[PDB]
């Protein structure tokens, strides 16, 4: 599994 990214970069 992955992760929906939140925040910069």
């Amino acid at each position, epitope marked *: 599994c992955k992760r*929906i*990214h939140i925040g910069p970069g």
Partner: antibody
Amino acid sequence: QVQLKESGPGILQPSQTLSLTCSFSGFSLSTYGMGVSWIRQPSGKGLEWLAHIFWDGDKRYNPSLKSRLKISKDTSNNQVFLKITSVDTADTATYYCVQEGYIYWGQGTSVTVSS
Amino acid sequence: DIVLTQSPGSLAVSLGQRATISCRASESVDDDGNSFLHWYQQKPGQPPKLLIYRSSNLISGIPDRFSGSGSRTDFTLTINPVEADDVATYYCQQSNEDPLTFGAGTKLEIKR
């Protein structure tokens, strides 16, 4: 810097199927770590996440909404689409598409499900 | 689902004073270390605006008056001093586990 923009059916009879299209600029969806979300806001009510697609083709669905949703991409055309099936009236809302990172949000389009 | 509960639901505050908002999660939203709780400001008409990410990190360009604290299940957002254009609704969001949830929103209203 980046643009996101939605396209909606405007009005829908109950129990049709909602098409939504998210047009973007600023990033191809083939870039590793790319992906686009669709978040839904009711009228003057909170936010609800609906679905998310990632660059590598894996889809994510709100599991209480997983039934009626389907996300997809036309990656060489900067498009993410959403189909929400069997539109109940408690589905009138505003659809935002958001690029990964959640900083960059598109204005959002209204759908009202009124017979 | 991880359910996020925000209090206060409504906040009357005067300008230049301190205002605290709170978000608590049904479970840990942490790896262990960094947490996956973020804070969005939504002005009427606009999209939510991300302010703070991973509990404590200010997004570039947001005023330093905005801070975030907390870990595991209890998180808090502080605006100090409240300037008249923070009269908005604030939401917290978790991104530890899908589905991605947001809280009910706290709205800041000026007192007079």
